[PDB]
Amino acid sequence: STKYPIVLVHGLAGFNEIVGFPYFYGIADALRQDGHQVFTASLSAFNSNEVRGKQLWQFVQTLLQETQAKKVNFIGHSQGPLACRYVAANYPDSVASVTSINGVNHGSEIADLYRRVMRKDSIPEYIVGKVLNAFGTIISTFSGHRGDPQDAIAALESLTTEQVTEFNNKYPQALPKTPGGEGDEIVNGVHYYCFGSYIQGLIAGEKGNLLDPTHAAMRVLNTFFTEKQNDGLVGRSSMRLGKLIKDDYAQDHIDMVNQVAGLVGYNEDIVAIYTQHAKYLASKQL
Ligand SMILES: [Ca+2]
């Protein structure tokens, strides 16, 4: 079991309420079965990465008080690793490690494209239709066709390349020096690790994902990236932070959090990525 408690971090504070199950599907339960102490910070998706960082620091202060641990091990997905990086940069004594899983560490090309769409920047109507349809599909899969089909796109405003480049200028710690490289494993006494994935193979071979309507949507979005290797939301290169563990899983962005409800690609054991890593962290004296 880890020395320091594990804090799972993601955006969409309302997820569990709206969807009816956790964002990290099955993962905290699996970790606890392995003896680790585990908490989840579900951060505000519709605001900036610095607002989420501040929220996460308030949560961490409260958690450190309740545990008497001196530090935490963050495991973030998507928006999560940026808020984790804010806390590690500002409050390194409180952070043992930052593990980023498909983090939007250098921006999302699909957030960039939506911004070109939102602003009417000469994107053809057929592309607009396919992007909005894909977003709607994913939204409605999770919300049970309940509610608005675009609103939750507000989450991408803080994930554009422009916004994330600004964030990275403030919080450069552990980023790669060469695009597509790795960062330093230890920066200011904090350990940084990354995982990622990119969509691979023809859709008919996907197994469980053939029952998950979000997968084909992710595949539509994947086709609009300049970076070929992408998970539907973020390019493989953009995920990099600290030391690479593994990033060639054949998984879309939400497959990597075991979604929807354990429907993932190729019979891969997503939860095992996390439990194996928690053992690795414990092996590093974290
Ligand atoms: Ca899936």
Author numbering: 2 to 287
Give verbatim lines from the article:
After a single round of mutagenesis and screening, we obtained a double mutant Cry3Aa–PML I118V, E130G (Cry3Aa–PMLVG) with improved pNPP hydrolysis activity compared to Cry3Aa–PML, resulting in a catalyst with 9% activity retention compared to soluble PML. Previous studies of PML and its homologs have shown that this class of lipases exists in two conformations, an open conformation, and a closed conformation. Current PML structures have only been solved in closed conformations, even when bound covalently to a diethyl phosphonate (DEP) inhibitor.
Nevertheless, crystals of the free PMLVG protein were obtained and its structure was determined by X-ray crystallography to try to gain insight into how the I118V and E130G mutations impact the catalytic efficiency. The overall structure is nearly identical to wild-type PML with the main structural difference being a change in helix α6 near the active site. Helix α6 contains an amino acid hydrophobic patch that has been proposed to be involved in binding to fatty acid substrates. As a consequence of the two mutations, helix α6 changes from an α-helix in PML to a 310 helix in PMLVG that orients its hydrophobic amino acids, particularly I154, into the substrate binding pocket and towards the DEP inhibitor. The net result is a constriction in the size of the substrate-binding channel. The PMLVG channel is large enough to accommodate a fatty acid substrate suggesting that PMLVG should be capable of hydrolyzing pNPP despite being in the closed conformation. Notably, assuming that the closed conformation was active, the tighter binding pocket in PMLVG compared to wild-type PML would be consistent with the lower KM deduced from kinetics. Another structural difference between the PMLVG mutant and wild-type PML is the loop region connecting helices α5 and α6. This loop is visible in the PMLVG structure but absent in wild-type PML suggesting it is more disordered. Soluble PML and PMLVG had T50 values of 45.6 °C and 40.5 °C, respectively, suggesting that the I118V and/or E130G mutations destabilize PML in solution.
